[model samples]
Structures are given as structure tokens and as C-alpha cells.
Target: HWGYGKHNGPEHWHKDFPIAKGERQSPVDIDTHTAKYDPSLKPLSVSYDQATSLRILNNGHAFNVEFDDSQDKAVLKGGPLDGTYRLIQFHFHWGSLDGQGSEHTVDKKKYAAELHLVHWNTKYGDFGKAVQQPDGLAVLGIFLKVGSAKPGLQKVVDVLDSIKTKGKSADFTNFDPRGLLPESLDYWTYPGSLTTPPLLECVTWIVLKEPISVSSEQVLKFRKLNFNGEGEPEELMVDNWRPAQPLKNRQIKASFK
Candidate 1:
């Protein structure tokens, strides 16, 4: 199995998943000064049903809040998307220490963490089939900085104790993902691939310009999560972020001027 370890990390992933070195890779550094402003981009429209949040699980890779996306219970439209995208799951990537961990960077600067809200294009039928096509997924990335505690994230942090070990899971419902987003919807958009294994090139990256805040203590709690299972030697689940990939010929478009 692949993980964020020295022996089998992102750099070596291309050995197994050839697409890991694909042209349109994700987590690229956003050079704001050079980004093209696209007037055609529409305001992002997001509608999430609180009851659709099913559970939270530590999947060894990252803690994910899985949602019921069987129907359009929670969907994202507008912005750079062609059709509607149903919320499937949401996860976070962080570092062991402060001043690092975000998968995507702005102006070559890294944030304390990054939140990923993964969605699959409803037009593709299922998430499995959607991941193979060019327009299969739409991931909304939000950078997290060190500041006051985010009340909206308290519900999620409170359950980390129960899901401390890998593979551990707990029922978590009535949680709306909308509260996690920043007030401003201005963003940067580009074509990219999944930051993890199989590294499928099917995502339309929608990275927000404004970052939200999380207290230092809150950020540390995320580090307490274990990458290993119950009986295995405890390995802190931190710094699970992938390095920024080359921009190649892709043009980053800003939703605002």
C-alpha cells in the first residue's frame, strides 16, 4: 500500500502509477501576479444538505467526512464547472509543524494546512467512472492559517479522539460543509489530477483566494492522529501533503480581477 512515507512517497509513486507524472498534475503553486483574469467565470453556487453527512473516518491516508451523494442532496454548480458536481467526501492535508502542509501554495507561500472538498461530476454517473474522464471531478481547496479557533470546525475536531487510529470511524451527521468555506468565493481555477495514488488527471481545481483560520491548538490535534493501525507502532499522521507539480502549459484563471 502507498503512503506518505520516505520509502513509498509521492516522488516514487510514478513507479506504480504512471499517471503520477502526467502533465496536468495537482497542487500547483498559484502565482497570483501572473494568473489570467477570466470575466466569463460565474459566481460559485454551493448547496449542501446537513443530513447528507454520513460519517467520519480515518482512512490511514487522511481523515475523510463521507457524504451521501447518491442523489443531488449536496451539489456544487457555477464557477468553472460545466455541469453539477455532487459532494462525495471532504478531507484535510497538514504538516507536522506550523508554516507548512498545504498541498497548493499561493505566491510560493505555504499555509498551515489545506482542506479538500471532493466532488464528482454528476454527468459522469458514478465517482468510479468519473475519475477516468477529463471532467470527472471538481475539488475545492481552502487554505488554513493559524488564528482563533474556528467554531465551524469544532464538531469535526471533537471526534478526532475516537478516530485516533487508522481505519477507525464514527457516525457524524447534520454537519454542513458550507460553514467551512471563506466568505469570499474568489478563486483560481485550472485542470489538475488527484494528489494521491492512481493520480488520475480528471480534476478541475477550484482554490479559494481567501484563507480561513484555525487555532494552533486545533491544528496540533490533527497531528495526534495515527497513520498506523491499533496494534501497530504509532506514527503521527502529519505532513501528508504532496509537493506542488509543474504548471506545464496550463493557464491558471482567476474568478476575479
Candidate 2:
């Protein structure tokens, strides 16, 4: 299984998933100085209701807050997208300690962690079908820094104990996912893929330049989660993030000047 271990880690991922070394891979370092600003890129639109939150579960990779994406009730538009894209799920990747964690770096600086809000283009069928198309997915990335506590994030962290091991889950109802976003939606837009295995080259990344704050204590609580399933040795799920890949020739566009 592809994991964060030294044996089956990012380095060896190319063996099984050749796409790991393919063009347009994600988690690229955002050199803020070089990102070209474009006035035409509209502000990112996120309209998600509290009722969409389904549950929080440990999916062996990272914990995900799965939402009800059956309808167009919650959609992401504007900002480099054509039509509507329905919100699917949101997850995170963090480091062993501070000074690292986020997949995308801004001007060579890494935040304490990163959050990804995944959405699928409704023009395509379901998630399984959409993954095949070039413009099937639009993922919004938000960097999380260690600072003042975020009440919105606390709601998700509070339930980590219930899902201490892999495959465990609990109700995460009435939680508005929008509460996790920063005030400024200005982001660096680029062509990229999912940072994890089976790294499909279908995502249009929208990474926010502004970072949301989270307390160090709250991050430690996240460390309590185990990558291992029940009846196995505990492997603390600290560094669940894949490192920044080669930039290739792709250009990153900024939404603000």
C-alpha cells in the first residue's frame, strides 16, 4: 500500500502509480513573486449549508468530512471555473510538528497544515465518471497556520477521539464547511492533480494566499489519530502530506495584484 512510510512512501510511488511522475502533478511550491496576477479571475464562490455535513471518518490516509453532494444545494462557482461544481468532501494534511505540513508552499514557506475542499463538475456524471475528464475536478486549498484557535475547526477536531484509528467514524452534523475558509479568497490558480496516489491530472487548483489560524494544542489532538487500523500497532498519522513535486513548465496564475 502506498503510504507515508520510508518504504512505501512518495519516492517509491512511481513504481505502481506511474502518474506520480506525470506532467501537471500537484503540491507545487507557489513562488509568490512569480505568480502572474490576473484581474479577470473572479472571486471564488462557496455556498455550502450546515445540513450538508454527513460524517467524519478516518479513511486510512486522512480524516474526511464527507458531505451530501447528491444535489446542487452546495456549489462552487466563479474563479477559473465554467459552470457549477458540487462540493464533495474536505480533508487535511499536516506535518509531524510545526514549520511544515501544507502541500502547496507560498514563497518557499510552508504552513502548519493544509485543507482541501474537493468538488466535481456537474457536467460530468458522478465522481467516478468525472475523474476521467480533463476538467472534472476543482479543488480549493487553504493553508492552516498555528496561531489563534479557530472555532470552526474545533468542531471537527473534537470528534477525532471517536475516530482515533483507521476506518472509524461518527456523526459530524450541522457543521458548516465554509467556516473553515479565510476572509480573502484571492488564490493562485493552476493546472494540477491530487497529491495522493492514482494522481489523476484533472484538478484545477485554487489555493488561497491567506492562511487560517489554528492553535498548536488543537494540532496535537490531530496527532492522536493512527494510520493503522484496529488490532494493529499504532502509527501516528502526523505527516500525511506529500512533498511539493517538480513544477515542470506549467504557469501559476494569481487572482489578485
Candidate 3:
């Protein structure tokens, strides 16, 4: 229902992304004032000993990573979360084609960019199959702000010269994605649908409350990535994030404490 062309925008996503019609959508602004009815909350699975591998891809839409379960070290335990789930791949959404960008909105506010950690239920065999299931996916949302120097991201930025355009990606061998996680894992989670096309509703959305900072220079480097291939003076690929949606009947919970 939504895309880059005519009538393609978040407001009309329900027409393009079928999952948007589901009872819930992700990246909502948490309202603490709302009553917390459920005591049981889910947290991300993390294990230092388990070495996972992530690959960065310069897909036309955005710079993304295809994560292999056999390579990733973090084991997503089964519980309220489907045991079959495994880390699949991750990517980012930014804005401005230039300056600021973000995926989630705060009180109708848009941010600089949004980072998505995508996972899928292994019960279905893999991501391709899991994406079809209503509860087969999980996504962790992290907001990105443009400001302050974030030395951590330099590991990826430093290589912009090599993978600076579309369809270009260097082997991100042995890179630790954990370093990219925000200081606060404390997050707000809810049952919601994917924000992009093929808007699968199976996603359990987990969004961190705290944002990670990137220096203006790093942000500039990010802007260099575009849908067009390397060295093309096409607009920078910043601010490609979608705006937040209404909560509808959905309830959001946080793991701050």
C-alpha cells in the first residue's frame, strides 16, 4: 500500500503492507501512565560465549545484514517467545536522504533513524518460512540520534569507501553486533506487526528506551549509503525510517526495572 511513489507513505501502509491491519503495530511511544497488567515480560537472549556472525549487505532499500543462526552466538530461549526462533538478519532505517532519520516516533515525533534486529522462529525452518507465520518473528527496535561521537560504530563506518554504494557489501567477518546495542537494554515491548512491506504481523516488537548516539561525521558516512550504487551522487540514504502508528487496542510493556 505504501512505497516511494504515489500514495506511498505510512498513513496508507495498510493498503500496501497487509500486516498493518493487524490489531497491533510496532515502534509505539510507551505511555507509562497506562496500567501495567502483565508481570511477565520478555528480554533479549544474550550469551558472550556463543559467537554469532553478521554480514552487512548494501541492499537497495538500506544497508542490511544477513545473520546466520549457525554463526550467531546469542541463543533466544524459548518461553513466552517461541522456542523455534533464531537470529536471522538485521538492518537500519534512516531519514533525510541527508540529515536526520528514524523509524519510531515519540508522541508523534520522528527521530534520526531506527535500527532493527530481526529474528525468526526456527520451528518454521528459517526466516523465509517464519515470515509467513503470524507469530514467527521478533524484532528489536533501537532509535538512532544524530550527535555526539560514537567510536563504536566506526568499525563499520571506516569501510564506507569499500561498500559506499548499492549492491556493495564487504565481508563483516567476526564482527560483534553486540557493540552496536544501546547502553540500556531496558526496553518497551509489545505484540505488533512489521513496519515495512510484507508487513508480517508475527513480530514481537522490542524497542529500547534509550538511544545510541553517533557523531555527526558518522551520520554523514551513513548518509553516503544509497539505493543507487557506489560513487553515484544520488541523495544520501539517511532518514529512511517510517513514522510511528497508533496503538489501537495494543498494550506496551517496559523492562526498565
Candidate 4:
């Protein structure tokens, strides 16, 4: 019942999901002065199996590339986290313009877009089960700068035509997400919730300091996607990102000093 439209946008989310205003709400602005640099934060380690990619789909909100999470084929460990987290799906959020799209901001600055690689704690069974726990999820956020075209991202963009509308999906395989990451894994970590509805306060966010590039054409391709299903009133899915929420009493810790 929630969307990025003016009618039921982030402003109206609190009506259905009280957690929208919860203590651990996500997508907070990162103030450098306040974000503490902790030496205890370990360097991140990411490993993805090329054969684990399952499919890609337009879920009426964002385009997501899903992976086979039946086992621990793709897992993330170290960093600020204690246990191994399995990669389930990765998606992007964008806006109408290159200036504003990222869910999380750094020093009050927004990026062209943002990428989220959502993972679940293996100790919790599965993603469905994991979502119910307080520490069920760990999401890695990567800022997307508007610059030279990303040759690595072109493969995903080329298939936009196949899934232009909601509920549309296509087989996406042989894709290793490692190709899409920025050079540095230095990041900021915090306790927060999912940016989207059902806004569960279960995520341990890891927002990277470095940004990868996405050309104007690449972003436009994402905008062409329809939030409505086929035969429904066409609503191009742009500016699907929610505004940054309150940081409250939590401390934001950084890996780099």
C-alpha cells in the first residue's frame, strides 16, 4: 500500500508502518564530525560464486538481481559484523536527477543513486526467518556517482526491456557481484532498519566511503521501468528512494580513521 508517489510516499508510510518512526530507522545522514572512527572495526571480506545468480526482476519498486541463497555460496564476513552473512539479493534506488537518489547521505551530500546488497545471518535459518530477528540483516550501501559509463553495470541495464513493468522477471545468471564494487571497503556502520515498508529494525548498515560510477544513460534506463504492472496506469519508477530518517541516540562507527 506504500509507494514513492506523492499520494503514499515516505510521508504516508508511518500510517501503515509505525516503525517508520522507530528508534533504529535507516537512511540517516552521515555527519563526519559525529561519525566516530573505531580501530576495532575489521576490514570487510566479500566472496561471491559466479554460478549463484538466479534471476532479475522489477518488483514494482526497484530492480533486483536475486541469487541462490539456498546455501552459503556467497557470503560476507568481518567488517563490523561478527558472523557470516549470506547474500540474497542486490538492488538499486534512483531518482529523476543525478543529484539525489541515494537513501543514505554523507556529510549531507546525496549521490545519483545507491546500491544495496542485502544479506541475512545464516545463524537465523533463512532471510524470511532472519527478518524477524533484531540482528537479522546486514545491508551494504554503495553510492553511485554520475560519471563515465560503468561497463560492469551494462549487462544488467541491457535487460531492462524484458522487465519494464512490475512482476516481470527474467533469468539472470553467471553474474558475480564482485565486479560492481568500489576499490575500497572502508565503511561506516550503524544499527538501522529497512528503508522500505514493513520497515523492520533489523539491519546493520555498512555504507561505503567510495563511490562507483553510473552514466546518465544507465540511470535513465532505470527510470523507464514502470512501478505499475502491465495494463495498469503507467508510473515510471523514478525517485523511489526514501528521505534520510532520524539518527536518534545511535553512534555511527567508521572503519577508517
Candidate 5:
């Protein structure tokens, strides 16, 4: 079993998990060509202050920030997708090394890393219950590319000195997930499953086509973290992303005007 800070990489993550073979997986590719027609949806509006109950947990492979939707910090706009969905947890997936980051591809092009902003529907009262609903989850996938210099990801790297090791997480107070959203909200939405185990098939994925870049050095430090229990230093983790799964005749759509 890949306990906290252990080596059970995603590839072998489902050994003891029940929902491993579920239909959905994260870090999937979002192509414009797969666009569909869905007119009832709109962009999500999230506020940091209203949403509290934020906590960070170290799950051995990645650090996740969980929130309590019982609060008002998270918000929603429009009717079809209306109603506030609590910000449950958000984490990251990066390459063990540098130069190869993104989990999903655009016409086969990879980026530097990927960040997931996970939210669950409040109608179910709690994240555990909300996760079971087909429309209960909403994940925003943002890509991090490598730049000759560094993109504006310093805000994220600044906290690395705290959770630099496995099974180690620091209290990231006053942190708002919205600040991490890219300037371009244009995205491709589709039905998918969680990239990790218990890969539930009830997720609505909104993968942004735009990618944010970071410095090469920042990516290297991410690989220095632990991965398995065999005392294996863990792969560079630079390409820690999973490849895109088949669309399966799924109709993907975009929010571009």
C-alpha cells in the first residue's frame, strides 16, 4: 500500500483501491476540435474571503487543500449550474524532472505542470456525499509550461520551503485558490473521471487550453521530493502527469465568445 509519502505512484495507485478502474481520470487533453453545443453553462465566479474551512493535507504523492462548503467563501453564478459548490480540495501534478509537465495535451503538446481546482456540489451537504453525484464535482485544469524565465508562479513556489518533503505539509493560511486562475478562462468542458483511484465517472471537467509557464529551477525542486517506501528517491516527477484518455464519443465544449 502506498501510504503517506510512499512510492505507490499513480500507475500502481489502485492496488487496494475499489474505484481504480472507474471511467474518469484527470490530466486529460482538451482540444478545441472536440467542441460541442451546450448553451446553459457560464464561467464560475469564486471568491476567497467568503470561502474558509481551507486545510492542507499531505497524501504522500501530492499536497491537497481541502475546504468546508458549509461556509460562504465559495460562490456560483447563473441558473443551470447555479448554487455554491464548496471548495473541497485542490492539488497539483508535475513531472519528476523539468521541461515535461502537463498531464493533458493540446494537439500532442505537453506543458511544464498541471494544477487542479476541485469543487463539490453543496446540495449533498458534504464532499464525501457530493462526490457521488454525476454533476457534483467541478475540476478546473490549468497547465504550467516552462519559460526561458519564470511565469508568475512565484506565489506558489514561495510556499515550497514548507512542504519540501513527503508526508509533510504546512498550514497555507490566507491562500485563495482563485488567485491561481489564469487570465484566460476559456476552457473545454466534458464528462470525465478522477485521475486518481476511485476514479468516479461523475465529474465535469473544465480544462483550460491556456498554459502558465514557470522557471526551470522551480520544476527541479518539485522532483526532489520523496515518492516510494523502498527508499527510492522517486522519479524526477517532471513528467508525473497521466496521458489523456479516449473521448469515447463524449462531446466536449468551450466557453469562448
Candidate 6:
């Protein structure tokens, strides 16, 4: 019903999901001058246990690495969050070409790709229940720039060969999500919704300031993924991102001045 293609892209989303046009829409352009400096914002606390990584799958929209979030094995605290949020899954959004894949932009600047580490509030008991509330989800957004090849990402890229088609999956474990993040935890936060269909207005977005490096070759591997399944004609999975939406009356708070 919803996709990145012309017939069912972001522009057409509001027809089905009314929240797509809601005031707190996500993937907003971050203007440094417009964002306020929040000295009181606490530093982010990320605790990811490698063993908690369960498996990786191609959901057709994107490749996601799901986690075992039954307990507090991997949880995030502080940083605009009201309570502990357990890591559920992490995924990427990329483009068919270089320098144009990230969902969120800074001063109109786009990156080669974007990574979302999605989590659900423990206060809600479970992710399904959390998605229905206003303060249910927290997503850590990391921008990926083109530069030196990221050795840490190779593990994910290598598995892409096996799950190139839609609906394919593989058992993935022993991967530490911490290695994929940048050194600095400085970020900008705001109230926003999911960038995809059903676009619920339940996300507390944390967009990191610093971007990690990924070689051009590494970035291209993401383009090789297919949007269509095995029998259908090949449709490369690229530009799998929603356009930036209106920020409305929301205030963007920065952890660092």
C-alpha cells in the first residue's frame, strides 16, 4: 500500500495514513540556528549486549537486525527519554546513488545513508502497546558519510549477498551495535513520527551530530538490494527514504551548544 516508488511514495502516504500530514511529522530539516541549546539535556546512555542480537531480515522496505528485547539486555536511558527504552531492532535507509539517502538532513545537507536504532519504552510493557501512545518510541539516528571504508559495517554488508531479495532472512548474532556509532553522543531532539506508513506520532527522535564513515563501495552494496521479490522484475532497493516533513511549532533541542 505504501512504498518509495512514484505510485505509493511519501507524497501519496497521507491519503491512507492521515498522520502523515500531522503536525509532528518526522525527518525534518535541522537548522542549527533554529535549534535551542539545552544545557539540561542528559548524555545518552546506550547498553547493547551482542548476544541480544537475534537475526537480520529483509522486510522488503529495508534490512533490519532484530533483537531479543524481552528483558533489559540492551536498553537506552537519558537523552530526552522519560524512562528506559529497550532496543528492538535497527535498520538502514539508503539511496540508489551517492550523497542522497539519509532521511533527516542538517541545514539542507544530505548524507549517503542513515541508520535508525529503534527502541520501545519499557513503561509501555511491550512494543505493540507502546506504538499506540504519544511517548512510546525513541529512535537514535546516525548519518553515514562517504569516506574511509567502515570495517564494522562489513559484517552487515557481507550478509546482504544472502538476503538480496525481498522477504529473505538469515540468522545474525554476536554483533555489537556500539561499534557502528560515532565517538560523540551529541544530538538534536524533537517530537516526531515514523518516516513510514502508519506514520505514528510516537517517536522521540535523537539525531546525532557526528557522522560515521563508509566507503563509496560500501554504500553501493546497499543499492544492490531488491525492492521486488524473486519472480518480479528486478527493482533495485535505492532511495528508500521519506522526504523531510514540516517541523510545525515544535522546538528542536540540542545537547551541545
Residue 225, candidate 2: alpha-carbon lDDT: 93
lDDT of 2 by residue, 1-257 (tens): 99998898889999999999988999899988889898888888877863388999998899999889888977899999999898889999999989999999887898899999999999997999988888999999999999899989889888899999988999888888878999988899999998998899999999998999999988999888999999999899989999899889999999988
Residues 1-257 of candidate 4: C-alpha lDDT, one tens digit per residue: 79999899999999999889899998999998989899988899888754388999999989899999888888888998879899999999998988899999998899989999999999989899999988899999999999889888988999999999999999988887987899899999999999999999999999999999988998899889999999999999999999899899999999998
TM-score of each candidate? Answer: 0.98, 0.98, 0.83, 0.98, 0.81, 0.98
Which of 1 and 5 is the better model by lDDT? 1
Per-prediction CA RMSD (Å): 1.0, 1.0, 3.2, 0.9, 3.6, 0.9
The Cα local distance difference test for each model comes to 0.92, 0.91, 0.67, 0.92, 0.64, 0.91
For residues 1-257, write the lDDT of model 5, one tens digit per residue.
44322366565666776555455555566665657546666765656556554456555666677666666567543323547665667777886555565667776677767888787777777778877888887777888776644434455567665665556666656566666666776677777887765667767777776766666787766666554323546533334556676666567776664
- Candidate 6 regions off by >4 Å? none
How many times do residue backbones clash in model 5? 24
State the displacement of the C-alpha of residue 243, model 6, in Å, after optimal TM-score superposition: 1.1
**Angstrom error at residue 67, model 5:** 3.6
Tens digits of per-residue lDDT for model 1, 1-257: 88999998888888989988779998899999999899999989888754289999999999999999888888889999988999999999999888899999999999999999999998879999999899999999999999989998999999999999988999998898877988998999999999998788999999999999999988989999999999999889999999999999999999998
